[PDB]
Design a protein around this nucleic acid. Structure first.
Lengths: 52, 119, 149, 85, 17, 50
RNA sequence: UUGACCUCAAAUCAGGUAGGAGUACCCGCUGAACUUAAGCAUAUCAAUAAGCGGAGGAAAAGAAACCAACCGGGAUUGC
RNA sequence: AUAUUGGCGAGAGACCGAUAGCGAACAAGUACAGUGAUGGAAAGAUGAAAAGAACUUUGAAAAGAGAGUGAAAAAGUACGUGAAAUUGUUGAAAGGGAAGGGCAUUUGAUCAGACA
RNA sequence: GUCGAAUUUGGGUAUAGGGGCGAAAGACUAAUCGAACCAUCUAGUAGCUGGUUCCUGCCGAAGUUUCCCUCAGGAUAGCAG
RNA sequence: CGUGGAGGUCAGUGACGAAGCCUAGACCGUAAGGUCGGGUCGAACGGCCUCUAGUGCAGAUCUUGGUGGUAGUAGCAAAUAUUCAAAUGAGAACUUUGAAGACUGAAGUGGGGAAAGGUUCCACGUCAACAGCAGUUGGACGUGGGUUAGUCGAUCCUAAGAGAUGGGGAAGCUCCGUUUCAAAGGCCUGAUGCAGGCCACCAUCGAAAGGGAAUCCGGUUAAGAUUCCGGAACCUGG
RNA sequence: AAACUUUCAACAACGGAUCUCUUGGUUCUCGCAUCGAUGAAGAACGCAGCGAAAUGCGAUACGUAAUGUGAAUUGCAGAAUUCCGUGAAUCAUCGAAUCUUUGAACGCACAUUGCGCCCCUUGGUAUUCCAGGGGGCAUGCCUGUUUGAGCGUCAUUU
């Protein structure tokens, strides 16, 4: 599905917070909040070169 | 267990009114007993009997209003057909079939002919 | 960049082109559907053919005027030259066109012949009463082919 | 202080329950809901809010009336009663 | 769950110049 | 607040009757999956936000 | 004094209809910048995204104030 | 004739197989966070069948040790299998400011065998 | 430090982001302010930094020429199989 | 050389044990790897000729989950303070009762309320988890009970202000405006028409601290009272 | 020599990888055209003998009538005539009904379970005050009805 892996509003924290620069989920009190988001290496992310 | 709809259909307006109050009195008693006995499932049958009497009263009373409005062009909105809103506003079979006098002459004079081309 | 000895290509894939790709997976299913619809239309209009009769015509430009192809419909001068009327020809499967003008006596005569031959090969059933039994012929273009003169 | 001492002053609601969507997004002073737009006739929905539409769209509720229409269409919007054959 | 934030910020000053 | 609207009190009434464990006999049912009341609430652990 | 006409009003007057939802496809209005140009302003992305009005099972188009320059074709739509 | 990531009813695939595939195989737009717009998870598998361990004994009890059900408790509702990091006991071995590795042989343990 | 006033303060109410508000510090506008917060365009672009997963056999370099808003980059001739 | 899946064949292996995991036990290959024995387990898997690809990890301050050393370590040190006996209990520095020594010291560590919370209020049962020690106790867990008004509030009025209508803008979502360029409606004399006459605010929303019709004492509950009970009063409408 | 530290094995721990499973997802294809003032989509609060939730339903509330089938439901209890029959059942089908408070939401309002007016009828000695029961009162526009306004305007009586 073309939506898969991209139904998220994540953004990168940037350098300076002792964490890598992959985008991350916002908010709090959820468990998903703060996770790696879009990248192909990220759990729940989008696969490299989605099959068309 | 419980009243039967096809038996009630033989009774009159007054009898079904008397039976409704009797069932309501009986349910009022059973409620006073459910707070002493751990379980009293019979309360269900009495509850559905009051539903059966009310439905047959409403069915008798609606039919009389339906005989009173027999054949007159305006009748209550509750009794008209509950089709879709769009099916209630489209042209009737009569109106959509209306054809001008000119077109009627042409259809009669030159109808589609059946034919075969083999021989 | 420009890198080696290769042709200069022009690929217009700079818009959001992935939102308007059409792959025709339906090629086979559309064929079965067109073929079914053909069969139900034949059963509805039986025993008439699925086609109307078309006229002989010359292709317009200088690249094609050496050839003759089918057309829209017989013109009013041809329909009258063949003993019919436009309003009636349309009820017995002859296509009529009111925009074409005859300006060449060779095509005019070929189409008049075509209409006369057609009327010799059809059976028009009576308006009321038992109609004769007849088998259905599905194409008239095949029954009346166009031959290059 | 901007932090802990400031948060101790929070005892006034800005939003209360909405009579239409019932969501506690009804601004008291503007008298409008930031979720459904009440009292505006239309319900608020934006095409950049794909998830927002999904949460509130048709089918997410009971469909007290619309669930039966497909049954009525199958039978041709019939009227009457079964014949008891 | 436990949110996390920019732990301290400031208090580092500037160096050399 | 002691002085409260009927709309708020009505929602507190619903919150009161929802504060109970899972009925025990539900675990004896055929093909039962429910283990505990997952929507349980307490005044000390989370707030209704009504 | 009485009766018309024109125009404009009021009724819990008799019978009707419009709003809201859905919105993948359809008919319009309005309308960017990121981006490409190894910079950048015309240009490009794009007559696109977002915003707004309006329908149906299809919509829209349609029987030439068309194409042509030929031995001339002949409504519209799709490949 | 043409369009259809929506609604309804069907048939399929060289597709994914529980960190995969939709965010959601489960009471999933659920619990939970924010004043608000909005953000938004983890979580499937005892056995063919509960036959889910009657009764005896120690303890205040939770539980333990027996007895029993089952093909199997090396399946006991902390339940198919049950890896690794990390850890307890038993056995063997070395150890003067790290440990580990390469060539060769002594010592201990272990392995195979031509066989006629 | 000041403590009868240019005083302290509750609730109600008005002002909304290139806007407000400012006895003026670029201060405050929900722990965010030399331009708030949320979703989308958006996987924005990067000549720049990091990473890029199995074995064996044969061969094997360049940091130089010319052109470029060219100097951490490319085209071009060379070296290479 | 190895992995997921596909067409053909070996009438391939298998509940008399397929796949997976463990094994300083064995053999083959220079290597990637392939093969056998034993233990554990329980329902499917492989050789060879071909086809196909979401096909091989030590790293990316990589993603998600699990777990160490540091380590029984830092520490649990503000607000003067505790002690003796019996009772309950398996168990008492921490619960109940009695005695003693102290503190808040009337801009209190006392007695009530507003915003906010939402059952925390009271009773019986009760200790797995929470009260960073303990617990027989608890604002915890299980099960119930409890909030009584003509007089107290809201309701009514208007304040800063918000906002229908009549109208004018705007492609439109909607903007301006509040008595404005409007034919803007309702009472009485009398008889539901009718004879008159009087009267133009202009809808409405906006205060549980502003304006405002009317209730006090005594008793009573495990938990309610200016609300219940006894007695004695008052205001509005009719 | 022990303890202690380290390497390996057997058993036991912590953890949930691997293997085998699958009422889910995902892409392709075929057919159909059906929401709303006859009150929709959505929301709030309620309903069972013992339910908190998902599912169903609306004071006729896990449902009422009607049609088909023909002995169940099940966690415990109940029903027992409901078993050669106008009849079990969270059964299938569905054409007749009910459908709380709301929402385009429509008497006016609504951080209020706030305040009115009209019609029929019942009780309080009551057309006027009070309470109960039932039925109503938004706005724009079209076609007609009735009642009107204007020296805009025609004829006619005097």
């Amino acid at each position: 599905s073309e939506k898969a892996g991209h139904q998220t509003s994540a953004e990168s924290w940037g350098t300076g917070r002792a964490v890598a620069r992959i985008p991350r989920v916002g908010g709090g009190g959820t468990g998903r909040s703060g996770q790696g988001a879009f990248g192909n290496m990220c759990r729940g992310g989008r696969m490299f070169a989605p099959t068309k | 267990a419980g009243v039967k709809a096809y038996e009630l259909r033989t009774k009159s307006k007054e009898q079904l009114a008397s039976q409704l109050v009797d069932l309501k009195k009986e349910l009022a008693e059973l409620k006073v007993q459910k707070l002493s006995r751990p379980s009293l499932p019979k309360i269900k049958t009495v509850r559905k009997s009051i539903a059966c009497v009310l439905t047959v009263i409403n069915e008798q009373q609606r039919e009389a209003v339906r005989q009173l409005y027999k054949g007159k062009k305006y009748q209550p909105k509750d009794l008209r057909a509950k089709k879709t809103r769009a099916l209630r506003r489209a042209l009737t079979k009569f109106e959509a079939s209306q054809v001008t006098e000119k077109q009627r002459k042409k259809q009669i004079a030159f109808p589609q002919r059946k034919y075969a081309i083999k021989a | 960049a420009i890198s080696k000895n290769l042709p200069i290509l022009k690929n217009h894939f700079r818009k959001h082109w992935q939102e308007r790709v059409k792959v025709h997976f339906d090629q086979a299913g559309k064929k079965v559907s067109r073929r079914n619809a053909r069969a139900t239309r034949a059963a509805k209009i039986a025993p008439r053919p699925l086609d109307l009769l078309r006229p002989v015509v010359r292709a317009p430009t200088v690249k094609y005027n050496r050839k003759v192809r089918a057309g829209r419909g017989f013109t009013l001068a041809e329909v009258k030259a063949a003993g019919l009327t436009a309003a009636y020809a349309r009820t017995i499967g002859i296509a009529v066109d009111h925009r074409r003008q005859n300006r060449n006596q060779e095509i005019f005569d070929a189409n008049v012949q075509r209409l006369k031959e057609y009327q010799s090969k059809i059976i028009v059933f009576p308006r009321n009463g038992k109609a004769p039994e007849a088998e259905q012929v599905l194409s008239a273009a095949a029954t009346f082919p166009i031959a290059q003169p | 202080g901007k932090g802990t001492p400031s948060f101790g002053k929070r005892h006034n609601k800005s939003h209360t329950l909405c009579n239409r969507c019932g969501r506690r997004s009804f601004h008291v002073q503007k008298k409008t809901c930031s979720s459904c737009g009440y009292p505006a006739a239309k319900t608020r929905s934006y095409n950049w809010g794909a998830k927002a539409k999904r949460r509130h769209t048709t089918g997410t509720g009971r469909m007290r009336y619309l669930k039966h229409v497909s049954r009525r269409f199958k039978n041709g919007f019939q009227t009457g009663s079964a014949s008891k054959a | 769950h436990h949110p996390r934030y920019v732990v301290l910020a400031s208090h580092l000053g500037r160096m050399m110049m | 607040a002691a002085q409260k609207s009927f709309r708020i009190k009505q929602k507190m009434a619903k919150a009161k009757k929802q504060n109970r464990p899972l009925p025990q006999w539900i675990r004896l049912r055929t093909n039962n999956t429910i283990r505990y009341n997952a929507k349980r609430r307490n005044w000390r652990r989370t707030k209704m936000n009504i």
